């Protein structure tokens, strides 16, 4: 029909893009601190 059909798909996907980036960062952030907590004990 029109671009709207795919644009409605688009806007949903960009919406997941927002959350995905959020979590990747949150996980990566956790990963960062999580290393530091173990290393200074496990390896020192």
């Amino acid at each position: 029909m029109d671009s709207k059909e795919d644009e409605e798909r688009y806007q949903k996907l960009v919406t997941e893009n927002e959350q995905l980036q959020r979590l990747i960062t949150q996980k990566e952030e956790k990963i960062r601190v999580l290393r530091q907590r173990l290393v200074e004990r496990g390896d020192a």
Binding site: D6, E7, Y10, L13, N17, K27, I31, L34, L38, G42
Partner: protein, 45 residues
């Protein structure tokens, strides 16, 4: 791709963000592997 109905400008950004989301959904599951990996390193003393 967009030869009609949907404008090229929309679908090209759509292809981009889909490749983006698929990649990000991959990375996200991977980062969980790094997450547990570290916890497996929390396993010892």
């Amino acid at each position: 791709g967009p030869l009609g109905s949907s404008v090229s400008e929309l679908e090209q950004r759509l292809r981009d963000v889909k490749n983006t989301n698929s990649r990000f959904r991959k990375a996200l599951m991977e980062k969980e592997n790094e997450l547990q990996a570290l916890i497996r390193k929390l396993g010892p003393e």
